[PDB]
A paper describes a structure:
BRCA2 acts during HDR to control the recombination enzyme, RAD51, a eukaryal protein evolutionarily conserved as RecA in eubacteria, and RADA in archaea. RAD51 executes the DNA strand exchange reactions that lead to HDR by assembling, in a sequential and highly regulated manner, as helical nucleoprotein filaments on single-stranded (ss) or double-stranded (ds) DNA substrates. Structure-based approaches to identify modulators of the BRCA2–RAD51 interaction have been impeded by the lack of a monomeric unliganded form of HsRAD51. We have previously described the development of molecular surrogate systems for RAD51 based on an archaeal ortholog, RadA from Pyrococcus furiosus (Moschetti et al., 2016). In brief, we were able to produce the C-terminal ATPase domain of RadA as a stable monomeric protein, and by careful mutagenesis, to convert the surface of the protein to resemble human RAD51, with the ability to bind the BRCA2 BRC4 repeat with high affinity.
Author numbering: 108 to 285, 309 to 349
The structure:
Amino acid sequence: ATIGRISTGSKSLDKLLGGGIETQAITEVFGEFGSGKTQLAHTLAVMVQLPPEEGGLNGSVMWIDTENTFRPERIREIAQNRGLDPDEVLKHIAYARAFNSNHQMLLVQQAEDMIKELLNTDRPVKLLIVDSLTSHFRSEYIGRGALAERQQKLAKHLADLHRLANLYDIAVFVTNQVATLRVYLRKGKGGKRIARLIDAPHLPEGEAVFSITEKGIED
Ligand SMILES: Nc1cc2ccccc2cc1C(=O)O
């Protein structure tokens, strides 16, 4: 289908990204604790539920959590501050906690069941979040003798995510620490945050400054 764009809530960040995050693509956001990557994930889980006129895609969300960072109270707060019903917004976020890298991989495969069920409805899955992509892979595969299998397993996981994104017109959004759009977050001045786009093949490298508010991400 046509490439849909989900607003991040920030006009500055959306301009940097070419209008927002894309369906049929993996957007990978990097940053240290406090850089705003989890705030962006929570904001996008709300924004995607809005109609296109308001920066969303009238969509449902699937969220894979590798380390206990999903906060339903933060969704409710962002939803209510954006004029949405907080309970309805939460009902349209399917949640899974992944306990290890094998289970994380299995969940991406299992997500296809619900994606297929909602595909021709009024609320198709339009956003699949994996927070935080490599935490289990880094913990489970230590050192020299483990790199080949860690890379093999991560490549398969990413291929599985790209397949769902392309086949079902979903924006895949992943968070991490240091063929996919890579955005680097950092602390800016006066409690603001900065996003830097690096090595995008068809978007200029640039920076966007944004704030974290009761609405989640905004300028
Ligand atoms: N069966 C499921 C699989 C998932 C896979 C990825 C993200 C969320 C998911 C939620 C469920 C659920 O039963 O609520």
